[PDB]
Amino acid sequence: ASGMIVTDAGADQPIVFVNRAFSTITGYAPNEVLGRNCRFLQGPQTDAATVARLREAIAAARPIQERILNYRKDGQPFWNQLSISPVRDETGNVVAFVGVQTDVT
């Protein structure tokens, strides 16, 4: 099952909702992640270039897909097939971002 994260659009994109599969994949409970930027999932072997591409896409509110190395709460690495998209209203304002995670280890 794939994880889902919803973040606010502004102000460094704090998490506002996660589904159950997010906890299955990452080992974090909702309480442990709400209000935080998702970058706590990264760690020392995460590819910096990939991170850069995410950062640039989010700042532009452009959809992006990447395979990124992430880490469970306990420190166990896993490969995340990650897809992020803005949620826009019909005037084009970005209301949120949604990300989908699949553990492809």
Ligand X SMILES: Cc1cc2nc3c(=O)[nH]c(=O)nc-3n(C[C@H](O)[C@H](O)[C@H](O)COP(=O)(O)O)c2cc1C
Stretch that binds a second copy, among 44-52, 55-63, 72-80, 82-90 (CB under 8 A): 82-90
Task: Using CB under 6 A, pick the residue from 16, 34, 55, 79 that binds ligand X.
Answer: 55
In which residue are the tokens 């973040």 written? 7
In which residue are the tokens 């935080």 written? 36
18 binds ligand X (CB under 6 A): no
Pairing of strands 64-71, 15-18: unpaired
81 binds a second copy (CB under 8 A): yes
Helix (H) / strand (E) containing 31: helix 30-33
Which of a second copy, ligand X, none has residue 74 at its interface (CB below 5 to 8 Å by kind)?
none
Phi/psi at 50 (nearest 5 deg)?
-60, -45
Task: Using CB under 6 A, pick the residue from 39, 61, 81, 94 that binds ligand X.
Answer: 39
Task: Using CB under 8 A, pick the residue from 15, 33, 84, 100 that binds a second copy.
Answer: 100
Q: Whole-angstrom Cα distance, residue 67 to residue 82?
A: 6
